[PDB]
């Protein structure tokens, strides 16, 4: 068994959906019965994404092994059944850190560390590492062709293409075939130049992807084929669509995967894409509609809550119901008040970092709780709900986290070391998929149909425990606890129609094919409530 | 007085309106009291545009001196008063013809004729020729930057620029800033690369033109400025508009001309663009509307009748009336019949070549004539009308032209040498602006308010005097005769509300500010008819 | 006062002598009375040059402030009297280390750290730092134009050229105009392309340097001028010569510096290059010649002992005597023996790290000592000489250094902490220019004509004073000691015609115009001995 590789690059303009295209392909390759995986290389100097804000790049994906990574790794999880790990994504800065450390340790024995070799060697080794044991490995190259930000990576690839042999590697390239209304037609010249640029750095494209807002005419595809030294059959058109789960269908329709198996001499069984065909059918034919309002902070950039948004979608798919998302700034609920929260069927409060308008988040939690409006809390949102309930039911005035107020006097959230009561009596970070003990009598236990459940985490502060007993005894159900320390993983409100809040991140586990019990329940509750409020 | 030059190039995609931008600038420069002119270099092997069809490139402009040239030369005539000549436009093929001829006759004395320097010499000498005696010369380079089709021209320019000095030259480069709805924003990357391409061939841009369907944000303009080595104030945004006549206003708004005179150390007077402001006001505030139907052949690409369309628009401007042009295929009138011609306020028949469904054109002429529907015929449209009237009123069975049916028997149109009667008894191309003697008692004489007029021509066959007397005596007014041979330049129908047809090309003289008597009359009559029918 | 900058780049091939050219220019501009400084940007990933071997890049330059840097910084010291510091040279690796550390510290506040703008800003800042307070700053750009290894730097430069303004910056570029004997002529094509490459990254050259083995014809220079958009007067020819001290003369001859002052509007006084002319005269007219053996380890690459070689040259210039260096592998002395050392007028042993042929080095020291042959030892050579004398005169069997033998038994060299005697009783790196106390009665005190001196260091181990009294009392002169702990700096042999050795690196202070007492004495001694033996 020899591993085959396909490299994916993009030129002309960014924002073409390189990760989406690659993921859609991978889904097909999976559907062809092939051991396909995928990795993404980034042109960033930041070593880890944890040093950047969500407004800067959107939500940071949490892998099973706890690694923080590029959002697109979650996108990969939404197309194939393999698991992403730290080996599936790294940055330019990461490379330098490692190489410079090797320098420091004398690993280059007095030699000059150059871009070529050494830096490109580091890259090559990482690629071989991640692709080990797989039939097909897709590699997404971040950055735009022609920009200096990723030339080292492009070079490392070229080297490997030669080292490995062209019989085990293909060059895929995304372009833009923009529509010029003034002329009344699309243009292909930008594409022609993008290809020329790849050629100037030692790369000859094998497969072309024509991104546009409309199908590109065969004639134009032929013109491209001519100028790029590419067979007409390898020039694929990809018009804009209203769902990424329809793309596998399109790629299959144009015979892309057949071409690929032919190039790799693979005996590939007919792709079974019916899983997504089902999803598409259901997606395009919902029986109902609900409105969910989301109160947060980074709502000016949807990408910041991308994983959440898609998780909501997945719940809606299983319940055949349209999901509307109201973007609400917590600072406005703080300012304007709960009038914002009117006209909603359900309330959503996501996680994140930053005090900002958290008091408006608390206000919202109170609103949903007090008015019995289908409430879902995640990470910070749970902490918010904890505070809400604590202050108004358990009467823990000024309940808060020590991360914002050193002496809350009611620190409902704190570090384990920092656990303490209101009288000052006392007694790092949790990341990745961890097993939680569900309470057999809780809804969540029954939602998963299991005593325990493994879910992803990303957070430093925990439920106090010293003051927990005040909150829990006041009338709050701990629906599940962690492992060794039995930490409050998830809660439910005794008399609320649907109120669930948790520490884990279910949004990184939901799929379009499986959905996810908590979003299924949440969205359903929204519908129930909606019908009740009529 | 030393001539200053500005070169115009464009990259990324074609069809950005290089001629439009250049003409708009020139208009402003004229408005500032500067002696401005303009030339265009074309990347084609065709020596003369007369060897190509109307559908291939659209209408071929006829200059005063009879030269056949690029449509854009007519566009230049519509913005500045400087008259174009054969020296204002030539092609790659033209150059080679000249150079090879010089080789053949020994002008290079045994030397090797090379692109560099001999082809570039042909080019730069022609440029200096055309720019003689002018303050500012705009030079438009056709083709797209990065393509081999025009690299010789770009090289000739580079050399020239060095020779004359930077104090006498500026580089204006058009680009495209495409809007990507999927991202919700415009991109600049393509532009950055386009500039890099010019730089790679020795050209550093001074002024950037950002074509788009919307204003480009100052921030984006600044980003471009950075990467292109260009001052922010020299980065001009140019969004799509509904009228070319509004462009001078936009360029003026962004201070383009001030920059230019500063660069050329010229004490330039403030631009008076009120002439176009008037036009714009009138254009945007017509008092009425009218439907004009046009029957022809090259309607599958409006460019073929561009000069006509503009002329109709100009008539509309003077009569504050919207002109609605219906495109009708002569072959459909031939097939379907006159039902096509219903719902029209007036009918127009353009010139051109090709028999095709001209019988339907004749049918149309008959229709408009017999139903008293305002009619305007140009060149071929006159030939058509001549046949119509001759065959159906003067009883000239099979009235026709020898260019299609030599054995006509009633050749109403024929080469002067070919003039003959129905008994076989007998007795190149007219080009450019020629004097026409108008009949003092004709409407056209009074429409122009002058004994004679001067108008452009292009045709080979003439009205057959041998049979003319039958037609004219039957009841048709010859509204004007040429000169030496008193050739029927223009006719009018005695009892038709407004039926005028002529040999000359009034559409090459009409401007948005001056208008033109025949379009003023036609369009007005069209409106009048409409009102008479309502 | 505003700082002016000149950037120096080069392409086509490596090894053109960019640093040499820049240094020669600086010398002229020094002679024009300008505040000239100079920096070099190192494309390597190594953070410090200390992590690379002498064979990898030759000798590593020691700056006054103790920084280790590129050899060319010493070359700068040999053309201008200003002082280099850590601010005059840094690497690519250094940049990343700094930036990543800033990232780690939260310096970019959650933003994406990108090459553009963050890496380039790091560069920009360092350039402004080093050039602060100077009239003219030369900046040598390492690497080769067109290679990805230095594109980030080239970009940072472009940006600064724009932000600073062209009135304060120039682009100088070295090329190769190779001689093609098969054709019988030189070619310019490579140059034309090199320039095009700079242009493609936003850089337009102002000054061209044509490296070759012969003067380039004015015609060819004109051809280049044409294709590069450069004035003929700015195309400088630079043929190969037998001395780098003749280059200022050549550059002056072609009017380079005048051009520069005109570009910077400087009223520069006529260059006084007579000091260099003197050096040249003396160089080209020695009255004698001597042969000096150099016993070492890195002799396979001259560059490893470059600073030493030049120091020897300078001594020869002052004594009008040719210096013939015989490179000798100390390992061959171990194999073949002292027969290698025959036919020499003087013996020299350079510094360095590694055992290899050190025992042979000792054998050589012994040979020169015992046979009264003008000996000069530096750093390691001193350590060697110490062992020689100690073992063979002070009877310190196996006199040695703890850097090679944990239990030397007679550790004549050791870390200060490691100082111990032969009975086991006891009691980082010295860098940069340090004050040494000379013994008034020593030869070197009188050679320097001063009580104390300041000289550069680069070593960790010291003379073990526990056993010094054995060595010194046996009959050996300590000619100088250091500071606080009076560490042994210089040793002289009581009855040897001329045998000295020292801890410091005099080769980093020697200049072509000033010379250096030590090397003057050494080379002189060689001559004296030569005559003594004749
Ligand atoms: N020749 C250059 C110029 C720019 N960049 C890269 O250009 C990118 C900027 O373009 P893009 O990522 O697409 O986003 P913006 O900078 O906002 O601009 P645009 O989308 O128009 O390119 C930066 O990441 C920078 O690393 C580079 O590497 N090489
Ligand atoms: N590197 C190349 C490749 C093609 N061409 C030019 O590429 C142009 C094609 O683009 P364009 O003129 O805009 O029209 P089309 O050929 O239809 O294609 P498109 O509009 O997409 O460029 C042709 O004119 C051809 O002369 C060239 O000169 N040099
Ligand atoms: N397109 C490339 C190719 C090479 N390198 C760099 O090229 C340098 C090597 O070239 P050079 O210094 O000239 O020496 P060699 O590699 O030995 O080969 P040569 O001298 O023939 O160029 C290396 O540092 C490598 O990082 C690069 O940056 N970009
Ligand atoms: N970018 C350019 C520049 C020059 N030329 C070609 O450059 C050649 C000149 O180089 P070459 O034939 O090698 O001889 P010379 O002109 O004498 O100069 P050289 O040999 O140094 O190139 C000319 O034929 C000319 O056609 C060209 O086609 N494209
Ligand atoms: N053909 C498609 N239809 C519509 N937009 C799509 C399609 N495939 C790609 N995209 C869009 O591309 C974007 C991907 O964003 P981003 O993560 O920046 O892309 P990339 O993977 O290229 O970095 C999404 O907004 C997605 O809607
Ligand atoms: N900003 C503008 N608004 C709208 N379209 C414009 C504008 N400027 C350029 N164009 C369009 O560009 C086209 C010019 O066609 P063409 O003659 O091919 O241009 P070029 O001069 O670039 O060859 C026209 O259809 C015109 O409407
Ligand atoms: N014109 C000149 N005459 C002879 N050789 C020269 C001249 N200018 C440069 N050099 C040579 O250039 C070499 C410089 O080597 P190196 O330091 O590797 O170059 P760089 O500093 O460009 O990397 C020396 O061997 C020197 O003799």
Euclidean distance between CA atoms C141 and C153, whole angstroms: 8
Positive or negative: CA dihedral B465, B466, B471, B475: positive
Euclidean distance between CA atoms A303 and A322, whole angstroms: 20
For residue C455, give every residue at least 6 positions away whose Cβ sits within 8 Å of its Cβ, in sequence order, or none: C433, C434, C436, C502, C504, C505, C506, C509
Q: How many CB pairs under 8 A join B and C?
A: 31
| Strand order, beta sheet including C499-502 | C321-329, C288-296, C346-349, C375-378, C499-502, C488-492, C477-481, C430-438, C452-459
Euclidean distance between CA atoms A248 and A22, whole angstroms: 10
- A114 at interface of C, judged by CB pairs closer than 8 A: yes
Buried b (16+ CB within 10 A) or exposed e, C281-317: ebbeeeeeebebbbbbbbbeeeebbbbbbbbbbbbbb
Euclidean distance between CA atoms A91 and A99, whole angstroms: 13
For residue C10, give every residue at least 6 positions away whose Cβ sits within 8 Å of its Cβ, in sequence order, or none: C16, C18, C144, C145, C173, C174, C175, C209
| Strand order, beta sheet including B36-42 | B89-91, B36-42, B136-141, B4-10, B169-176, B207-212, B235-239
Neighbour tally for B339: CB within 10 Å: 9
- C51 at interface of B, judged by CB pairs closer than 8 A: no
Phi, psi of C516, rounded to the nearest 5 degrees: 180, 110
Phi, psi of B115, rounded to the nearest 5 degrees: -55, -55
User: How far away, in angstroms, is B143 Cα from ligand 2 center?
Assistant: 8
Neighbour tally for B158: CB within 10 Å: 20
In residues, how long is chain B? 534
- Active-site choice (B77, B310, B472, B507): B507
For residue C167, give every residue at least 6 positions away whose Cβ sits within 8 Å of its Cβ, in sequence order, or none: C264, C265
| Selection from A391, A323, A390, A334 nearest residue A358 by Cα | A334
Ligand 3 atom with the smallest distance to the CA of C143 is 12
Euclidean distance between CA atoms B141 and B123, whole angstroms: 12
- Active-site choice (B228, B379, B436, B502): B379
CA-CA distances (angstroms) from residue C291 to A497, C343, C507?
A: 101, 8, 19
Neighbour tally for C512: CB within 10 Å: 23
Q: Which helix (H) or strand (E) holds A525?
A: helix A517-532
Q: According to DSSP H, which parts of C35-80 are helical? A: 54-57, 72-77
Q: Regarding beta strands C68-69 and C61-62, do their DSSP bridges make them parallel or antiparallel, or are they unpaired?
A: antiparallel
CA-CA distances (angstroms) from residue A327 to A263, A293, A348, A353, A384?
A: 47, 6, 10, 17, 18
- Pick C110's closest partner by Cβ from A52, A100, A155: A52
Q: Which helix (H) or strand (E) holds B35?
A: none
Q: What is the 3-state secondary structure (H, E, C) of B265-298?
A: CCCCCCCCCHHHHHHHHHHCCCCEEEEEEEEECC
Q: Does residue C117 have a cis bond before it (omega within 30 degrees)?
A: yes
CA-CA distances (angstroms) from residue B155 to A372, B199, C127, C244?
A: 76, 12, 36, 39
Instruction: Examine the residue annotation and report whether A507 is marked as an active-site residue of this protein.
Output: yes
Euclidean distance between CA atoms B311 and B294, whole angstroms: 13
Euclidean distance between CA atoms C67 and A1, whole angstroms: 53
- Which position has the token pair 């596998």? A248
| Smallest CA separation from ligand 2 atom 10, residue | A189
For residue C498, give every residue at least 6 positions away whose Cβ sits within 8 Å of its Cβ, in sequence order, or none: C374, C375, C521, C522, C525, C528, C529
Positive or negative: CA dihedral B108, B113, B119, B121: negative
Euclidean distance between CA atoms A314 and A22, whole angstroms: 21
Q: Which of C180, C183, C189, C220 to mutate to test the pocket of ligand 4 (most atoms within 8 A of CB)?
A: C189
DSSP character for A533? -
Q: According to DSSP H, which parts of C323-357 are helical? A: 330-335
Q: Regarding beta strands C399-401 and C410-414, do their DSSP bridges make them parallel or antiparallel, or are they unpaired?
A: parallel
- Which position has the token pair 């009291």? B33
Tokens at B410, concatenated: 């009633």
Euclidean distance between CA atoms B172 and B11, whole angstroms: 11
Q: How many CB pairs under 8 A join A and B?
A: 49
Q: Using a 6 Å cutoff on CB, does residue A351 contact ligand 5?
A: no
For residue A181, give every residue at least 6 positions away whose Cβ sits within 8 Å of its Cβ, in sequence order, or none: B213, B240
Identify whether the C-beta of residue B532 lies closer than 8 Å to the C-beta of residue B478: no
Euclidean distance between CA atoms C383 and C355, whole angstroms: 12
For residue A456, give every residue at least 6 positions away whose Cβ sits within 8 Å of its Cβ, in sequence order, or none: A62, A64, A431, A432, A433, A434, A504, A505, A508, A509
- Which position has the token pair 């580091």? A122
- What region, left, alpha or beta, does residue A314 occupy, with left being phi > 0 and alpha being psi -120 to 50 degrees? alpha
User: How far away, in angstroms, is A17 Cα from ligand 6 center?
Assistant: 31
Positive or negative: CA dihedral C357, C363, C366, C367: negative
Identify whether the C-beta of residue C519 lies closer than 8 Å to the C-beta of residue C314: yes
Asked if A57 lies within 8 A of C112 by C-beta distance, the reply is: yes
Sort out which chain A residues have CB atoms less than 8 A from C56's CB and list them: 110-112
For residue A274, give every residue at least 6 positions away whose Cβ sits within 8 Å of its Cβ, in sequence order, or none: none
- Which position has the token pair 């040494």? C436
Identify whether the C-beta of residue B156 lies closer than 8 Å to the C-beta of residue B120: yes
User: How far away, in angstroms, is C157 Cα from ligand 1 center?
Assistant: 17
CA-CA distances (angstroms) from residue C408 to C391, C474, C501?
A: 12, 20, 22
Euclidean distance between CA atoms C494 and A485, whole angstroms: 80
**Domains identified in chain A and CATH numbers:** 1-285 (3.40.50.300), 286-534 (3.40.50.880)
- Pick B189's closest partner by Cβ from A14, A181, A187: A14
Q: In a 3-state reduction of DSSP, which class is residue A153?
A: helix
Tokens at B110, concatenated: 């045994």
| Smallest CA separation from ligand 6 atom 27, residue | A182
- Pick A96's closest partner by Cβ from C100, C108, C152: C100
Tokens at C22, concatenated: 């820049």
For residue B491, give every residue at least 6 positions away whose Cβ sits within 8 Å of its Cβ, in sequence order, or none: B382, B385, B386, B476, B477, B478, B479, B500, B501, B502
Tokens at C132, concatenated: 């602060």
Identify whether the C-beta of residue B478 lies closer than 8 Å to the C-beta of residue B244: no
Euclidean distance between CA atoms A343 and A526, whole angstroms: 12
Q: According to DSSP H, which parts of C202-305 are helical? A: 218-228, 247-253, 256-263, 274-283
Longest CA–CA span in chain C (Å) reads 79
Euclidean distance between CA atoms B245 and B277, whole angstroms: 8
Identify whether the C-beta of residue A341 lies closer than 8 Å to the C-beta of residue A313: no
Find the helix packing angle between B380-392 and B465-473, rounded to 10°.
60
| Strand order, beta sheet including C136-141 | C89-91, C36-42, C136-141, C4-10, C169-176, C207-212, C235-239
For residue B281, give every residue at least 6 positions away whose Cβ sits within 8 Å of its Cβ, in sequence order, or none: none
For residue C287, give every residue at least 6 positions away whose Cβ sits within 8 Å of its Cβ, in sequence order, or none: C320, C321
Phi, psi of A455, rounded to the nearest 5 degrees: -140, 155
Asked if A114 lies within 8 A of C149 by C-beta distance, the reply is: yes
DSSP character for C147? S
What is the DSSP track for A77-104? HTT-SS---GGGEE-HHHHHHHHHHHHH
Instruction: Examine the residue annotation and report whether A277 is marked as an active-site residue of this protein.
Output: no
Sort out which chain C residues have CB atoms less than 8 A from A103's CB and list them: 45-47, 51, 93
| Selection from C160, C144, C141, C120 nearest residue C197 by Cα | C144
| Strand order, beta sheet including B488-492 | B321-329, B288-296, B346-349, B375-378, B499-502, B488-492, B477-481, B430-438, B452-459
| Selection from A191, A176, A73, A214 nearest residue A130 by Cα | A73
- Which position has the token pair 């519509």? B78
Euclidean distance between CA atoms A402 and A414, whole angstroms: 5
Identify whether the C-beta of residue B386 lies closer than 8 Å to the C-beta of residue B412: yes
| Smallest CA separation from ligand 6 atom 22, residue | B17
CA-CA distances (angstroms) from residue A489 to A354, A374, B3, B17?
A: 21, 19, 81, 63
Instruction: Find residues 85-104 of chain C whose CB sits inside 8 Å of chain A.
Output: 93, 96-97, 99-100, 103-104
CA-CA distances (angstroms) from residue A43 to A14, A91, A92, B190, C153?
A: 13, 6, 5, 19, 17
User: How far away, in angstroms, is C256 Cα from ligand 4 center?
Assistant: 27
CA-CA distances (angstroms) from residue C362 to A243, C462, C479, C493?
A: 80, 18, 21, 15
Identify whether the C-beta of residue B162 lies closer than 8 Å to the C-beta of residue B7: no
CA-CA distances (angstroms) from residue C172 to B142, B164, C154, C204, C268?
A: 34, 24, 13, 9, 20
Q: Which helix (H) or strand (E) holds B496?
A: none
Identify whether the C-beta of residue A195 lies closer than 8 Å to the C-beta of residue A235: no
Euclidean distance between CA atoms A113 and A115, whole angstroms: 7
Sort out which chain B residues have CB atoms less than 8 A from C158's CB and list them: 229
Ligand number nearest CA of A195 is: 2
Asked if B162 lies within 8 A of C204 by C-beta distance, the reply is: no
Chains touching A (at least 3 CB pairs under 8 A) are B, C
- Label residue C60 exposed, middle or buried (CB < 10 Å: 0-12, 13-18, 19+): buried
Euclidean distance between CA atoms B102 and B106, whole angstroms: 6
Sort out which chain C residues have CB atoms less than 8 A from A110's CB and list them: 51-53, 55-56
CA-CA distances (angstroms) from residue A55 to A40, A120, A304, A429, C108?
A: 21, 31, 6, 22, 14
Identify whether the C-beta of residue A307 lies closer than 8 Å to the C-beta of residue A71: yes
Resolution in angstroms, to 1 decimal, for this deposition?
Answer: 4.6
- Pick B229's closest partner by Cβ from C162, C200, C229: C162
Euclidean distance between CA atoms B210 and C329, whole angstroms: 68
- Label residue A505 exposed, middle or buried (CB < 10 Å: 0-12, 13-18, 19+): buried
Q: Does residue B117 have a cis bond before it (omega within 30 degrees)?
A: yes
- Label residue B396 exposed, middle or buried (CB < 10 Å: 0-12, 13-18, 19+): buried
Q: According to DSSP H, which parts of A352-420 are helical? A: 358-370, 380-392
- Label residue B485 exposed, middle or buried (CB < 10 Å: 0-12, 13-18, 19+): exposed
Positive or negative: CA dihedral A61, A64, A68, A72: negative
Identify whether the C-beta of residue B374 lies closer than 8 Å to the C-beta of residue B345: yes
Ligand number nearest CA of B245 is: 6
DSSP character for B504? S
Identify whether the C-beta of residue A472 lies closer than 8 Å to the C-beta of residue A478: yes
Euclidean distance between CA atoms C419 and C402, whole angstroms: 9
For residue A143, give every residue at least 6 positions away whose Cβ sits within 8 Å of its Cβ, in sequence order, or none: A43, A149, A150, A153
What is the DSSP track for B398-458? TEEETTT-TT-SEEEEE-TTT-B-TTS-B---EEEEEEEEE-TTSHHHHHHTSSEEEEEEE
Euclidean distance between CA atoms A140 and A21, whole angstroms: 10
Q: How was this structure determined?
A: cryo-EM
Euclidean distance between CA atoms B250 and B24, whole angstroms: 9
Q: Give the CA radius of gyration of chain A.
A: 25
Euclidean distance between CA atoms A374 and A294, whole angstroms: 12
What is the DSSP track for B190-205? HHHHHHHHHHHTT---
Identify whether the C-beta of residue B76 lies closer than 8 Å to the C-beta of residue B23: yes
Phi, psi of C272, rounded to the nearest 5 degrees: -95, 90
DSSP character for A115? I
- C406 at interface of A, judged by CB pairs closer than 8 A: no
């Amino acid at each position: 068994m020899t591993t085959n590789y396909i490299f994916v690059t993009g030129g002309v303009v960014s924002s073409l959906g390189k990760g989406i295209a690659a993921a859609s392909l991978a889904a097909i390759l999976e559907a062809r019965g092939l051991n396909v995986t995928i990795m993404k290389l980034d042109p960033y100097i930041n070593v880890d994404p944890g040093t950047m804000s969500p407004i800067q790049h959107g939500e940071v994906f949490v892998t099973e092994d706890g690694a923080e990574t590029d959002l697109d790794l979650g996108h990969y999880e939404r197309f194939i059944r393999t698991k992403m790990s730290r080996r599936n994504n790294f940055t330019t800065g990461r490379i330098y850190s490692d190489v410079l450390r090797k320098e420091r340790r004398g690993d280059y024995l007095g030699a000059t560390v150059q871009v070529i070799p050494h830096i490109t060697n580091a890259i090559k080794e990482r690629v071989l590492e991640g692709g080990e044991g797989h039939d097909v490995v897709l590699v997404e190259i971040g950055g735009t062709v022609g920009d200096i930000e990723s030339l080292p990576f492009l070079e490392a690839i070229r080297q490997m293409a030669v080292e490995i042999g062209r019989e085990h590697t293909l060059f895929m390239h995304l372009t833009l075939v923009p529509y010029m209304a003034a002329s009344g037609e699309v243009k292909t010249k930008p594409t022609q130049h993008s290809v020329k640029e790849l050629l100037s750095i030692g790369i000859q494209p094998d497969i072309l992807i024509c991104r546009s807002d409309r199908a590109v005419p065969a004639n134009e595809r032929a013109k491209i084929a001519l100028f790029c030294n590419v067979p007409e059959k390898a020039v694929i058109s990809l018009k804009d669509v209203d769902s990424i789960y329809k793309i596998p269908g399109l790629l299959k329709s144009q015979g892309l995967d057949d071409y690929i198996c032919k190039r790799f001499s693979l005996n590939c069984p007919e792709a079974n894409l019916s899983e997504w065909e089902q999803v598409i059918f259901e997606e395009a034919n919902p029986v109902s509609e609900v409105t969910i309002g989301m109160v947060g902070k980074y709502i000016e950039l949807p990408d910041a809550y991308k994983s959440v948004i898609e998780a909501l979608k997945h719940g809606g798919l299983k319940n055949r119901v349209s999901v509307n998302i109201k973007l609400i700034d917590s600072q406005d609920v703080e300012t304007r008040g709960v009038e914002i929260l009117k006209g909603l069927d359900a309330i959503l409060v996501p996680g994140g970092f930053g005090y900002r308008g958290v008091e408006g988040m608390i206000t919202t939690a109170r609103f949903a709780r007090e008015n019995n409006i289908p409430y879902l809390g995640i990470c910070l949102g749970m902490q918010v709900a904890l505070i809400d309930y604590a202050r108004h039911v358990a009467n823990m005035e000024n309940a808060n986290s020590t991360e914002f107020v050193p002496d809350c006097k009611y620190p409902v959230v704190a570090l384990i070391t920092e656990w303490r009561d209101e009288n000052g009596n006392v007694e790092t970070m949790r990341l990745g998929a961890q097993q939680c003990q569900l309470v057999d009598d809780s809804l969540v236990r029954q939602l998963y149909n299991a005593p325990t459940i493994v879910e992803r985490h990303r957070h430093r502060y925990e439920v106090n425990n010293m003051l927990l007993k005040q909150i829990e005894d006041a009338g709050l159900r701990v629906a599940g606890r962690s492992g060794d320390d039995q930490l409050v993983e998830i809660i439910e409100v005794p008399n609320h129609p649907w109120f669930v809040a948790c520490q884990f991140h279910p949004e990184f586990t939901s799929t379009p094919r499986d959905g996810h019990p908590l979003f299924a329940g949440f969205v359903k509750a929204a519908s129930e409530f909606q019908k009740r409020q009529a």
